[PDB]
Amino acid sequence: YIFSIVTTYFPGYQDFVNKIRSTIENSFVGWELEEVLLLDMSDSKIQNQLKKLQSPIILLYCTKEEATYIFEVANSVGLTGYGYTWIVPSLVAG
Amino acid sequence: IQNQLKKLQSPIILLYCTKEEATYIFEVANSVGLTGYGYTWIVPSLVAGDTDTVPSEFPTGLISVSYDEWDYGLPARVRDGIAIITTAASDMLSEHSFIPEPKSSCYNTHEKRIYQSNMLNRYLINVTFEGRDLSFSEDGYQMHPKLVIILLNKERKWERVGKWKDKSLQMKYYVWPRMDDHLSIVTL
Amino acid sequence: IGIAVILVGTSDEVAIKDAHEKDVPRVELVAMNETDPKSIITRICDLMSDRKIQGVVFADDTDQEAIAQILDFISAQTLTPILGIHGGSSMIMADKDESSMFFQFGPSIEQQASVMLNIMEEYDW
Amino acid sequence: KIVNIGAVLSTRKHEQMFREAVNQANKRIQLQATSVTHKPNAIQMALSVCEDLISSQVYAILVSHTPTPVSYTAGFYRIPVLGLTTRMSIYSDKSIHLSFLRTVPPYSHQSSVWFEMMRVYNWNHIILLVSDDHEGRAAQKRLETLLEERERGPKAEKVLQFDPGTKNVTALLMEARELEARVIILSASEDDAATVYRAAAMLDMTGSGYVWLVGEREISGNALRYAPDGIIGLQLINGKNESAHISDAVGVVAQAVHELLEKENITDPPRGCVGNTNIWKTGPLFKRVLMSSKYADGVTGRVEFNEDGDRKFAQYSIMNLQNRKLVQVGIYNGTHVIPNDRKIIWPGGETEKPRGYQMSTRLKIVTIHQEPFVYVKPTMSDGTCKEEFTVNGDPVKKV
Amino acid sequence: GTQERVQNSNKKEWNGMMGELLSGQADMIVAPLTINNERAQYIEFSKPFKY
Numbered sequence: 001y002i003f004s005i006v007t008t009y010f011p012g013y014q015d016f017v018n019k020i021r022s023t024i025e026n027s028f029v030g031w032e033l034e035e036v037l038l039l040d041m042s043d044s045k046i047q048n049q050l051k052k053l054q055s056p057i058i059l060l061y062c063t064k065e066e067a068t069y070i071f072e073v074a075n076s077v078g079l080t081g082y083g084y085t086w087i088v089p090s091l092v093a094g
Numbered sequence: 095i096q097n098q099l100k101k102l103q104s105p106i107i108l109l110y111c112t113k114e115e116a117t118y119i120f121e122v123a124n125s126v127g128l129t130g131y132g133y134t135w136i137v138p139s140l141v142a143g144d145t146d147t148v149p150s151e152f153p154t155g156l157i158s159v160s161y162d163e164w165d166y167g168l169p170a171r172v173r174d175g176i177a178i179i180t181t182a183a184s185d186m187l188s189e190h191s192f193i194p195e196p197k198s199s200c201y202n203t204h205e206k207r208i209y210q211s212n213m214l215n216r217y218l219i220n221v222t223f224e225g226r227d228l229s230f231s232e233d234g235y236q237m238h239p240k241l242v243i244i245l246l247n248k249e250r251k252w253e254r255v256g257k258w259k260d261k262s263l264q265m266k267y268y269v270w271p272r273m274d275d276h277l278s279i280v281t282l
Numbered sequence: 283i284g285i286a287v288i289l290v291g292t293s294d295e296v297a298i299k300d301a302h303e304k305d306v307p308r309v310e311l312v313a314m315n316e317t318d319p320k321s322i323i324t325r326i327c328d329l330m331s332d333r334k335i336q337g338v339v340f341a342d343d344t345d346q347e348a349i350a351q352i353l354d355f356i357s358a359q360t361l362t363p364i365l366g367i368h369g370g371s372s373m374i375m376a377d378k379d380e381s382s383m384f385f386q387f388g389p390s391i392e393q394q395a396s397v398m399l400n401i402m403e404e405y406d407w
Numbered sequence: 408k409i410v411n412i413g414a415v416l417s418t419r420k421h422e423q424m425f426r427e428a429v430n431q432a433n434k435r436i437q438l439q440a441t442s443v444t445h446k447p448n449a450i451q452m453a454l455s456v457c458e459d460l461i462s463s464q465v466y467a468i469l470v471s472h473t474p475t476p477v478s479y480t481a482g483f484y485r486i487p488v489l490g491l492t493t494r495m496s497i498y499s500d501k502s503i504h505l506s507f508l509r510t511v512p513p514y515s516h517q518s519s520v521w522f523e524m525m526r527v528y529n530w531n532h533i534i535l536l537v538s539d540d541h542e543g544r545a546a547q548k549r550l551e552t553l554l555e556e557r558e559r560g561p562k563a564e565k566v567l568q569f570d571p572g573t574k575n576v577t578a579l580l581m582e583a584r585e586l587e588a589r590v591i592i593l594s595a596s597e598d599d600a601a602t603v604y605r606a607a608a609m610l611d612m613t614g615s616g617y618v619w620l621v622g623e624r625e626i627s628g629n630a631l632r633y634a635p636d637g638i639i640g641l642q643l644i645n646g647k648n649e650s651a652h653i654s655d656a657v658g659v660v661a662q663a664v665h666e667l668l669e670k671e672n673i674t675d676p677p678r679g680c681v682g683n684t685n686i687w688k689t690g691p692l693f694k695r696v697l698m699s700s701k702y703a704d705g706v707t708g709r710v711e712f713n714e715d716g717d718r719k720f721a722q723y724s725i726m727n728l729q730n731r732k733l734v735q736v737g738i739y740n741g742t743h744v745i746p747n748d749r750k751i752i753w754p755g756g757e758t759e760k761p762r763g764y765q766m767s768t769r770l771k772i773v774t775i776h777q778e779p780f781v782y783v784k785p786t787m788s789d790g791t792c793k794e795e796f797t798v799n800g801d802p803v804k805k806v
Numbered sequence: 807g808t809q810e811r812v813q814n815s816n817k818k819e820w821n822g823m824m825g826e827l828l829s830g831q832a833d834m835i836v837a838p839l840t841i842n843n844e845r846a847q848y849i850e851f852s853k854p855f856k857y
């Protein structure tokens with residue numbers, strides 16, 4: 001029970017955050033939404049704030065190309081397999 | 095391994111390296127969670143001549159320590175030097191009535207007063223003058239070096255901040271700018 | 283009872299006029315500006331034999347830190363104390379020959395570390 | 408396309424052989440070479456050598472056998488050097504200007520074999536011995552960094568820095584005997600080693616039970632004059648046979664000029680002690696390439712350099728004393744263990760290696776004077792203390 | 807009417823008096839109402855007037 005949300009200006013945008021926020025405001029589970037960010041590709045400075053995310057679990061919603069780009073920028077800056085874990089919806093690839 | 099540099103979750107960091115490597119490492123670092131907020135750095139004197147401009151990637155803070163250009167009042171320093179030589183000569187003539195001579199040149203092997211050199215070397219280290227203590231160990235260390243502190247302003251230059259003398263520190267401001275979370279709470 | 287002072291390639295704006303009152307210490311001030319190894323050598327062996335005194339003391343502006351090395355190798359010929367000031371073999375000599383004779387007017391690394399720790403204390407980190 | 412090389416040796420025929428070798432290598436872009444002889448009193452050396460910079464870009468000079476720090480007068484100009492007797496100090500350091508490549512392991516590196524030596528016999532309790540001054544410090548630092556705890560491994564029990572030249576060391580030897588280990592390591596000057604061996608006449612009561620792995624000077628004659636028998640020591644494959652060293656050097660300099668063929672940027676230092684302010688014969692690049700696989704695949708240096716060189720390859724040769732003279736017994740090619748073939752004669756117990764230590768059984772115990780736990784009483788006249796009895800006729804024990 | 811459960815639809819009700827306050831029924835509550843940091847999330851309290 002700790003996570004964050006990272007998105008980038010793709011349609012079907014605010015539905016995502018809204019559904020989660022609605023779900024965390026209930027159920028008496030004690031969920032803790034540390035931070036929500038926003039990147040706009042067309043940079044690392046805000047992704048520098050991506051290092052502010054000290055959370056074990058991360059969420060992400062974007063397209064495959066932007067995913068590659070962001071993963072490139074991230075793995076350089078304290079984003080790895082140790083001390084992390086990621087989740088992404090189905091739209092990654094076949 | 096510089097990724098492990100991100101493992102350092104500490105407020106204060108120390109660093110010892112050459113200027114080129116410093117630029118390189120600062121480049122690699124500022125990209126990866128190394129900035130002015132939530133950090134502070136300290137580096138020994140070997141960064142550069144302070145009047146020389148600092149490189150670009152050379153970030154804010156960067157407290158260091160060295161002599162100062164003001165310490166380099168040339169006439170005062172050469173005066174102190176000739177004084178230390180003269181007072182050591184006087185001391186090695188006070189504890190003993192033997193005098194160092196003029197010597198011979200790069201002519202051949204001639205070490206007549208070689209034993210006296212060690213004897214001269216002996217008194218050249220605890221000898222003082224003018225009230226101040228200008229002493230040495232056997233490795234070229236002014237046993238009490240007039241040091242100062244410097245940090246850089248927005249990008250401008252190095253400010254004469256703190257003065258050091260025999261475990262004595264003259265300090266200013268009690269406060270450091272963050273490029274809010276600092277709150278001044280009054281009490282009673 | 284002598285001393286000699288050198289200013290190599292450095293803005294030779296100085297006159298003592300106040301040594302005889304330091305209570306004979308007698309100077310012979312020279313100012314080259316060639317920053318030449320060979321010139322340093324030929325002068326030092328010249329100036330010693332000519333200026334029949336011991337304990338030269340000089341300074342410089344550039345920072346090709348080999349000057350310390352060349353000067354110490356000069357000091358290899360014993361009974362010849364030398365003493366740098368502004369550059370005066372500017373930066374530092376990390377170690378030293380045993381039979382040699384030299385000083386630097388420079389802070390050793392450990393002293394700098396002790397200052398670093400005094401700061402770390404006095405500002406409570 | 409002409410480049411020049413210089414040399415400061417002691418015999419003219421050596422320089423002539425060098426010239427023949429460099430012409431043979433250039434046959435294998437002009438590569439003319441010069442040379443000069445060493446100096447009697449070493450001070451005119453700098454004046455003599457910077458006139459050997461009289462050719463446009465005199466690159467690395469080659470010198471034979473403490474020497475005059477030509478590197479100093481060359482470091483001012485960023486010029487490499489040769490590697491002939493690069494051991495008598497710690498030249499291999501960026502304190503002396505980054506103007507020196509060794510190509511020959513300096514005595515410090517020797518210690519490393521010792522460590523590997525331990526893997527042969529699993530010794531894990533060693534005493535160190537160091538002459539307090541400027542080279543044993545290097546030996547120490549190397550042995551320390553060679554002690555990795557990457558996990559019950561070996562551990563150096565106690566090190567005893569002794570002042571150089573001081574005849575009396577017997578106090579340190581009484582300190583040694585009180586220790587528990589049985590393996591000594593001595594690394595100092597040959598005169599000091601002789602002083603120890605003589606003073607080991609009373610210390611030879613380590614001898615038949617003990618063993619040591621002395622360094623490389625202490626098998627020279629001034630130590631043979633007082634050497635005991637069990638003196639397992641080391642040797643390098645090549646002494647002062649400069650000619651083969653000249654060959655290796657010329658191979659390195661030939662592949663070097665081949666690297667120089669590129670014209671990204673070329674510039675020469677001035678011809679002679681003209682008084683130029685700064686020098687840049689693209690020193691940084693020259694060194695950055697010389698440290699990268701010179702591979703003068705000739706006699707010896709068949710593998711690349713470290714920050715010091717060393718060929719990353721040990722031609723190390725063990726040497727045991729057969730009670731009167733040395734014997735080459737086995738060798739090591741780096742970590743390559745080439746074991747011996749003859750019988751390793753140890754001190755008197757000549758066939759078994761007393762591999763380990765004599766676990767002591769005496770114990771000096773200290774206590775304090777607490778009332779209901781211990782008790783302190785004065786003795787009787789006879790020194791002992793009177794026998795008592797508990798209320799139940801049990802004999803009370805006292806010490 | 808503190809935080810109860812539901813028939814498993816949303817599980818955030820604030821029934822009773824808090825219901826009348828939050829859902830626009832009323833605009834003030836004068837009653838012996840305690841101070842509880844759960845209640846301090848959605849409400850605004852006056853100073854204490856009885857310990």
Ligand SMILES: *[C@@H]1O[C@H](CO)[C@@H](O)[C@H](O)[C@H]1NC(C)=O
Pocket residue numbers: 313314315
């Ligand atoms: C010092 O520099 C200038 C020339 O650049 C001039 O004053 C003088 O020639 C130089 N000194 C000597 C000893 O030549």
Ligand SMILES: *[C@@H]1O[C@H](CO)[C@@H](O)[C@H](O)[C@H]1NC(C)=O
Pocket residue numbers: 574575576577606
């Ligand atoms: C060393 O000192 C001891 C006493 O301190 C003395 O008995 C001995 O003769 C001295 N010399 C040697 C070589 O041990």
Ligand SMILES: *[C@@H]1O[C@H](CO)[C@@H](O)[C@H](O)[C@H]1NC(C)=O
Pocket residue numbers: 648650651706
């Ligand atoms: C030096 O080595 C070469 C080849 O390794 C050999 O031909 C020559 O005889 C050796 N000379 C000496 C003096 O060892």
